């Protein structure tokens, strides 16, 4: 992984992210939602677990985006958790949780769940 | 379980449910959200997995409530998944998923996640 992870990844819904996998487990880069404009670019940061692998396993990783930049503050953050599988059709398969800041009466409906697959293509 | 499960259960948020655990895995009863009025009572249905247990494990179970009755149609359903642990302080610890009917553009934010503990008290 590491070298395989670094680059640009696209999902099914139009989003892009660019990430560098740094040598001791660090992931850093930016997530852009849409349009093609500075206003949809947000910072990401995460970690991946580098492993000596003999059997074709995925590499486990996770990153967080807080949805605040200089043009938008959506009072929320998303985490994605999943694994990188390299090769011909490398993908990162993830499940994600999006939490919004709520009042304590609304806390029980603060968190959405879903899933994304990202490909290099 | 079976005999232990049948009865009334309360969660942290004010909700009540009454369930019968029938001999071959069936759960049936009603969920009432609040107030103390026919209008907050909804049908539940689920299953539990009966097991010969030698080591103090929970019993796995799950049920579904669709949020439509004669006074309300909220265009959604919740499933709870977890386990019953009997004894002095019997509880059912669960995680739940609530999906609302959406248009296909909004499908990605159709599903909330959270958790509830129910007790007999």
């Amino acid at each position: 992984a590491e070298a395989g992870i670094t680059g640009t990844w696209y999902n099914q819904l139009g989003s892009t992210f660019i990430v560098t996998a740094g040598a001791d487990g660090a992931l850093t880069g930016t997530y852009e939602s849409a349009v093609g404009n500075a206003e949809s670019r947000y910072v990401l940061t995460g970690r991946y677990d580098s492993a000596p692998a003999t059997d074709g396993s995925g590499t486990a990783l996770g990153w967080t985006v807080a949805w605040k930049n200089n043009y938008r503050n959506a009072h929320s953050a998303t985490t994605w958790s999943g694994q990188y599988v390299g090769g011909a059709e490398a993908r990162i398969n993830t499940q994600w949780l999006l939490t919004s800041g709520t009042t304590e009466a609304n806390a029980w409906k603060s968190t959405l769940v879903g899933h994304d697959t990202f490909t290099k293509v | 379980a079976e005999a232990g499960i049948t009865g009334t259960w309360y969660n942290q948020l004010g909700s009540t449910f009454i369930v019968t655990a029938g001999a071959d895995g069936a759960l049936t009863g009603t969920y009432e959200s609040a107030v103390g009025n026919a209008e907050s009572r909804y049908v539940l249905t689920g299953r539990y997995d009966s097991a010969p247990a030698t080591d103090g494990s929970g019993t796995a179970l799950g049920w579904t409530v669709a949020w439509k009755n004669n006074y309300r149609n909220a265009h959604s359903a919740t499933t709870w998944s977890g386990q019953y642990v009997g004894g002095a302080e019997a509880r059912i610890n669960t995680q739940w998923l609530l999906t609302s009917g959406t248009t296909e553009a909004n499908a990605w934010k159709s599903t909330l996640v959270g958790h509830d503990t129910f007790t007999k008290v």
Binding site: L13, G14, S33, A34, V35, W67, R72, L98 | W108, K109
Partner: peptide
């Protein structure tokens, strides 16, 4: 038009 969705 939450920043995680399409567009926005």
């Amino acid at each position: 038009c939450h920043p995680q969705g399409p567009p926005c």
